Amino acid sequence: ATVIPNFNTTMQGSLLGDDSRDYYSFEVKEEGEVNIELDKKDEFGVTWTLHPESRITYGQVDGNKVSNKVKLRPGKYYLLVYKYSGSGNYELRVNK
Numbered sequence: 001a002t003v004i005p006n007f008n009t010t011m012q013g014s015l016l017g018d019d020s021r022d023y024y025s026f027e028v029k030e031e032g033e034v035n036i037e038l039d040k041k042d043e044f045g046v047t048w049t050l051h052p053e054s055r056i057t058y059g060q061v062d063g064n065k066v067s068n069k070v071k072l073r074p075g076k077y078y079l080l081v082y083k084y085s086g087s088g089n090y091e092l093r094v095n096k
């Protein structure tokens with residue numbers, strides 16, 4: 001996984017051709033709501049799935065944005081960005 005070292009900060013990714021999955025992780029130190037936002041930089045079928053290291057959460061696809069909010073306990077989390085159709089690039093933010 002690519003470590004996302006802080007919140008409210010943009011990551012760039014790419015899912016062209018054979019590249020169908022990108023892996024991230026982040027750590028929560030204080031309980032609270034996170035807003036995970038993917039912004040498509042190309043039109044294609046992309047979403048994400050969050051699961052804890054120790055309930056899973058999915059992105060909700062709203063046009064160019066694929067996002068959701070969830071209250072997370074302290075711990076490590078894994079975030080899979082993956083495609084289901086086509087190819088393209090994206091930006092990703094874990095807001096808190």
Ligand SMILES: [Cl-]
Binds near residue numbers: 027028
């Ligand atoms: Cl935190």
Ligand SMILES: [Li+]
Binds near residue numbers: 013014019022
């Ligand atoms: Li990629």
